[PDB]
Ligand SMILES: O=C(O)CCc1nc2ccccc2c(=O)n1CC(=O)NCc1ccccc1
Ligand SMILES: [Zn+2]
């Protein structure tokens with residue numbers, strides 16, 4: 001992945017309740033292939049399901065999303081995976097909740 005991107009500044013502190021990697025898509029309620037937004041912590045499905053996180057990106061401009069499948073982080077603007085110290089806490093919390 002990229003070791004940095006200019007959108008890491010938009011990564012916000014982890015939600016009150018923590019992360020729930022089994023949380024369904026906030027639009028369609030699918031359990032499959034969800035991502036969490038690293039700005040606002042809404043959960044929406046991936047492009048191969050119904051594309052709700054890509055719709056969220058378009059209507060919010062929020063850049064960075066974390067996969068509840070493989071804990072990869074995608075930047076929609078840089079069109080790349082990103083891994084950096086600023087993402088360790090959210091990835092560690094998601095990993096603890098999943099495994
Ligand atoms: O789906 C989203 O909405 C967010 C992830 C994403 N969005 C894109 C939007 C447009 C074009 C390409 C991508 C892309 O490769 N990714 C990354 C991606 O889909 N990687 C494969 C993958 C990784 C983990 C879990 C499921 C799929
Ligand atoms: Zn959906």
Ligand SMILES: [Zn+2]
Nearest residue numbers: 037039040062
């Ligand atoms: Zn968001």
Ligand SMILES: [Zn+2]
Nearest residue numbers: 005007075078
């Ligand atoms: Zn970026």
